[PDB]
């Protein structure tokens, strides 16, 4: 998330989001609430 | 503690032990050579 | 409410009660029924026609005694109503049937109809915010602080042993004998006329209870004490007379170990408990040899423990160390364990709304107790 | 780039593990999960319901054991993940998983689906950097440091014979038998009911397994040894009970060479073993005469290799000197051999990165199989 905290341009921002998504792959290993996950989805939407 | 609690009601194992008990009492060697000649 | 739910030591012989956090069941009294034996005519006498308290067990010759509990199970629900009214007396509570949750006790292997009947009264007569009933065995280990162990209660309703592995009960391994000290008193009455003693009254029965709890004791040697030349000590009767004793002072409690003498087919409390042990795992019994818990008022006897130990010695396995506890309060401890349970915020499943009972009934409680 | 790998010597009965370059497997715990039989309504006891190891062996009573793996083919793959998660326990690892190379074990004559699903676990649920597992017999040879050899493992119910020439196995001369101590103990249970005894519980059966491992050996001439009378030196249970023996001490382990007597079209370890030897080179058998690798812990028997020498004389060649290698860390031999391999800079060529799995996965499994 520090990448978006220090996000500068489209390429860096976009690729940072890509790395973010790859880290988001941990759901199969966490089991976190679907609704809270959706909260995070739109949270990232607001952040973006 | 429950000392005054014991003073109130009479169900206490007075002058008696609370515990009873049944007392005490006193490689793989290798080289299995089938020397066939 | 932010205060103490009603803790009731639903006692077989003697029922007690109090509240959460407290260590004194403030009110203790036997499970009898006190109505009168005669009719007052004189203007200015005592009235009520239904008595509890000391006045009831004062004028025994004037008050008809009717014990309403049978094998730990009452069938005189009207008397239970009146009993709970006495529980609600100004001498006791001055409260309502809605201000606190109700905790009562039980014994297993009973008809669910009892639980039905019970809750029916508890909610048709009362408007209890939360009702719960369970086994004192859990409460017993709570009093001992343990987790596992086998507890045998000896009340005047039913004597039953429960093996316990951290609360994970084994319903296929619990034993329950329906004997009481009441029968031993009756048996004593048999010894009375054997020795020529004319006693048949209900008032006399309580005197025999005093004899039981005082003049009787336990003879450790089974048949060696059976052949002892008695001396027939004499007990000075409270009214002012005196009567001999004889060897019967220890003979009668042996019927609890030889029920076949009266005709009841069983195997003796000791062997019955051993059979309960036999209805379990193999090496977990080894723990139970150390885990021996005593309970019930019908355990207070001079010679009780060591004799029972000898019984166990005959029932002992091949060279296994055995530890036997003996709590002081073999009855009160259960009430205190109930006070501990009532002092829990994790009583969530146990507190049940009255509306829920209206919706389902005792079955809803059966799901919780099962 | 990698970290210190961990060799996981998967014994068919007991899995073992430990970091690279070491001499003793760090962990040694079996392959089964228990779940409690009895439940409770009591508040304050244990939790978990899934235990492996001293927790399970501790309270065997309710935890009903179930072996998830059968001949490598496990059916509780999800539970194996939980098992490996237990390998990542606080008492076990406290390390990470997606940042370290590892090493498990692999026996031959298996469906590829197992390896496929294994890669799915370690590279879908995990993100292990690089990992490659191969044939266990080579690890035993690493422990020997001897080019050619006839490895014969001994799992719980799994056995296989493999000849290897300087790091080269014989795919057309490698055999396998689907049994070891598993049905031997089951057959002992058969003997138990043959003389009236049942040990139907899972834990009870493992106790029987321990008894087998505790008192069993090999006889000389089975039908001729049957002519005597077994005095049956009774052992006494942890429960404290009589334990007879019967021919079990010598007859029951020889079931391996009598599969027809147990119902299986098979011949014998040594039989099919020497047959594959006959399928090998006319010259390499000479080398294998001294190169007889014994492995697997099921092999613990009095005169084990000696009766095997008798089997050698049964399958005698045309008078050529033979020699057997019988070490004492046969189970550990594979773990230590992996540790040797794990202590090699040659794993660079012997590995498969996770990136390779990302690229192909299944194709990397098929193509880069060995
Ligand atoms: N001091 C005593 N000695 C022997 N027995 C006793 C004593 N006090 C009470 N009891 C026995 O306890 C029984 C009363 O049942 P109890 O143990 O009170 O069960 P509960 O508390 O569940 O009513 C009676 O049979 C009586 O004989
Ligand atoms: N005293 C003994 N006699 C025979 N076998 C034994 C003895 N003690 C342990 N074992 C065996 O050790 C073996 C270890 O098997 P396992 O770990 O499954 O081997 P592998 O690593 O070949 O799969 C088990 O099969 C068990 O039966």
DSSP, residue by residue, D115-164: HHHHHHIIIII---SB----BHHHHHHHHHT-SSEEEE---SS-EEEEEE
Residue that the structure tokens 């004499």 belong to: C234
Nearest CA in chain C to B20: C324
CB contact under 8 A, C168 and D39: yes
Contact C330, B11 (CB under 8 A): yes
| Distance set, CA D145 to CA C173, D225, D341 (Å) | 58, 39, 12
DSSP A1-48: -HHHHT--SHHHHHHHHHHHHHHHGGGGGT---HHHHHHHHHHHHHH-
**Touching check for C326 and chain B: CB below 8 Å?**
yes
Tokens of residue D56, six digits = 């399970």
Identify the bridge partners of residue C150 per DSSP, sorted by sequence position.
Answer: C163, C292
Backbone angles phi, psi at D253, to 5 degrees: -70, -25
- DSSP class of residue D102 equals -
CA atoms in the 13 A half-sphere facing the CB of C220 = 9
Tokens of residue D184, six digits = 């031997």
Contact C103, C335 (CB under 8 A): no
Specify the CATH number of the domain D179-266.
3.90.640.10
The alpha carbon of residue D16 and the mean position of all alpha carbons in its chain are separated, in whole angstroms, by 10
| Helices and strands, counts by H and E, chain D | 15, 12
Neighbour tally for D79: CB within 10 Å: 19
Neighbour tally for D255: CB within 10 Å: 18
Planar angle of CA D214, D216, D217, nearest 5 degrees: 130
| Distance set, CA D241 to CA B22, C6, C98, D50 (Å) | 19, 49, 57, 30
Tell me the three state secondary structure of residue D177.
strand
Q: Name the maximum alpha-carbon separation found in chain D.
A: 74
Identify which of D42, D36, D2 has the alpha carbon closest to the alpha carbon of residue D19.
D2
CB contact under 8 A, D38 and C168: yes
Tokens of residue C342, six digits = 């009532």
CB contact under 8 A, C166 and D40: yes
DSSP D22-83: -SS-SEEEES-BB--S-----SSS---S-B-SHHHHHTTTT---B--EETTEES-HHHHHHH
The best mutation among C143, C156, C216 to test binding of ligand 1, ranked by most ligand atoms within 8 Å of the C-beta, falls on C156
Contact C87, C93 (CB under 8 A): yes
Torsion sign, CA atoms C49, C53, C59, C65 = positive
Identify the CATH assignment for C1-136+334-368 out of 3.30.930.10, 3.90.76.10, 3.30.420.40, 3.30.230.10.
Answer: 3.30.420.40
d(CA C352, CA C115): 14
| Distance set, CA C52 to CA C13, C33, C92, C190, C289 (Å) | 15, 8, 12, 29, 43
Tokens of residue D155, six digits = 């799992």
- Select from B22, B25, B28, B34 the residue whose CB has the most chain D CBs within 10 Å, as the one to mutate to test that interface: B34
The alpha carbon of residue D249 and the mean position of all alpha carbons in its chain are separated, in whole angstroms, by 22
Q: Kind of pairing, strands D242-243 and D73-74?
A: unpaired
Closest residue by Cα to atom 26, ligand 2, is: D298
Q: Calculate how close chain D gets to C307, using CA atoms only, in Å.
A: 25
d(CA C154, CA C337): 17
CB nearest to C318's CB, from D39, D60, D240: D240
Contact D46, D64 (CB under 8 A): no
- DSSP class of residue D224 equals H
Chains A and B are touching, with contact defined as 3 or more CB–CB pairs separated by less than 8 Å = no
CB nearest to C166's CB, from D46, D237, D239: D46
Contact D324, D146 (CB under 8 A): no
Residue that the structure tokens 């006399």 belong to: C204
Method: cryo-EM
Ligand nearest to the CA of D296: 2
Identify the bridge partners of residue B21 per DSSP, sorted by sequence position.
Answer: C323
Q: Kind of pairing, strands C14-19 and C6-9?
A: antiparallel
Domain definitions of chain D by residue range: 1-136+334-368, 137-178+267-333, 179-266
Tell me the Ramachandran region of residue C247: left when phi exceeds 0, alpha when psi lies from -120 to 50, beta otherwise: alpha
d(CA B34, CA C79): 93
Domain C1-136+334-368 matches domain C137-178+267-333 at the CATH topology level: yes
Q: Which residues in chain C touch residue D44, judged by CB atoms under 8 angstroms apart?
A: 147, 167
Tokens of residue D350, six digits = 């012997």
Specify the CATH number of the domain C137-178+267-333.
3.30.420.40
Tokens of residue C7, six digits = 């803790």
**Which residues make Cβ contacts (< 8 Å) with residue D134, sequence separation at least 6?**
D106, D350, D370
Tokens of residue C157, six digits = 């309703």
DSSP D296-323: -GGG--TTHHHHHHHHHHHT--SS--EE
Identify the bridge partners of residue B20 per DSSP, sorted by sequence position.
Answer: C324
| Distance set, CA B27 to CA A10, C168, D137, D209, D213 (Å) | 70, 43, 22, 20, 14
Backbone angles phi, psi at D308, to 5 degrees: -65, -35
Identify the bridge partners of residue C294 per DSSP, sorted by sequence position.
Answer: C152
Resolution, Å (one decimal)? 6.7
**Touching check for B2 and chain C: CB below 8 Å?**
yes
Identify which of C260, C282, C268 has the alpha carbon closest to the alpha carbon of residue C315.
C268
| Distance set, CA C48 to CA C39, C42, C55, C63, D290 (Å) | 12, 15, 11, 11, 106
d(CA C197, CA C201): 12
Planar angle of CA D221, D224, D226, nearest 5 degrees: 105
Backbone angles phi, psi at C139, to 5 degrees: -65, -30
d(CA C212, CA C230): 18
Neighbour tally for D262: CB within 10 Å: 15
In this structure, what is the dihedral angle of CA atoms C29, C33, C38, C43, given to the nearest 10 degrees?
70
Residue that the structure tokens 């316990």 belong to: C164
CA of C46 to the centre of ligand 2 (A): 86
**Which residues make Cβ contacts (< 8 Å) with residue A15, sequence separation at least 6?**
none
In this structure, what is the dihedral angle of CA atoms C223, C225, C226, C232, given to the nearest 10 degrees?
180
Tokens of residue D38, six digits = 């009895």
Report which secondary-structure segment, H or E, holds C56: helix C53-56
Chains C and D are touching, with contact defined as 3 or more CB–CB pairs separated by less than 8 Å = yes
- DSSP class of residue C237 equals P
Backbone angles phi, psi at D117, to 5 degrees: -65, -30
Tokens of residue D222, six digits = 């089975």
- DSSP class of residue D189 equals H
Is C354 exposed, middle or buried (CB count within 10 Å of its CB: 0-12, 13-18, 19+)? middle
d(CA C174, CA C150): 9
Q: Calculate how close chain B gets to C65, using CA atoms only, in Å.
A: 24
Could you tell me the end-to-end alpha-carbon distance of chain A, in angstroms, rounded to an integer? Answer: 11
**Touching check for B3 and chain C: CB below 8 Å?**
no
């Amino acid at each position: 998330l520090n990448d978006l905290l220090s996000a500068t341009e489209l390429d860096k921002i976009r690729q940072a989001l890509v790395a973010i998504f790859t880290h988001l792959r941990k759901i199969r290993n966490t089991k976190y609430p679907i609704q809270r996950a959706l909260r995070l989805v739109e949270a990232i939407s607001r952040d973006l | 503690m429950a000392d005054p609690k014991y003073a109130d009601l009479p169900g206490i194992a007075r002058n008696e032990p609370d515990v009873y008990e049944t007392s005490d009492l006193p490689s793989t060697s290798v080289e299995h050579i089938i020397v066939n000649p | 409410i932010a205060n103490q739910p009603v803790v009731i030591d639903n006692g077989s012989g003697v029922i007690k009660a109090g509240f959460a956090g407290d260590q004194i069941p403030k009110y203790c009294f036997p499970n009898y029924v006190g109505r009168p034996k005669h009719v007052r005519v004189m203007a200015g006498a005592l009235e009520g026609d239904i008595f509890i308290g000391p006045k009831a067990e004062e004028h025994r010759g004037l008050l008809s005694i009717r014990y309403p509990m049978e094998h730990g199970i009452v069938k005189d629900w009207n008397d239970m109503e009146r009993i709970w009214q006495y529980v609600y007396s100004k001498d006791q509570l001055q409260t309502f049937s809605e201000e606190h949750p109700v905790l009562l006790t039980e014994a297993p292997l009973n008809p669910r109809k009892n639980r039905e009947r019970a809750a029916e009264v508890f909610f048709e007569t009362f408007n209890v915010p939360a009702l719960f009933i369970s086994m004192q065995a859990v409460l017993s280990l709570y009093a001992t602080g343990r987790t596992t162990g086998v507890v045998l209660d000896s009340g005047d309703g039913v004597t039953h042993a429960v093996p316990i592995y951290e609360g994970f009960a084994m319903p296929h391994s619990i034993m329950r004998i329906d004997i009481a000290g009441r029968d031993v008193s009756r048996f004593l009455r048999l010894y009375l006329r054997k020795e020529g003693y004319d006693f048949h009254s209900s008032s006399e029965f309580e005197i025999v209870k005093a004899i039981k709890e005082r003049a009787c004791y336990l003879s450790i040697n089974p048949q060696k004490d059976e052949t002892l030349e008695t001396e027939k000590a004499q007990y000075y009767l409270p009214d002012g007379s005196t009567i001999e004793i004889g060897p019967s002072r220890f003979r009668a409690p042996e019927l609890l170990f030889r029920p076949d003498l009266i005709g009841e087919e069983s195997e003796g409390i000791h062997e019955v408990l051993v059979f309960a042990i036999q209805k379990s795992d193999m090496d977990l019994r080894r723990t139970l040899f150390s885990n021996i818990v005593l309970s019930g008022g019908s355990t207070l006897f001079k010679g009780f423990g060591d004799r029972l130990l000898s019984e166990v010695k005959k029932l002992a396995p091949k060279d296994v160390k055995i530890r036997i506890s003996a709590p002081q309060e073999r009855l009160y401890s259960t009430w205190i364990g109930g006070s501990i349970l009532a002092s829990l915020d994790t009583f969530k499943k146990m507190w049940v709304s009255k509306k829920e009972y209206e919706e389902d009934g005792a079955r809803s409680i059966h799901r919780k107790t099962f």
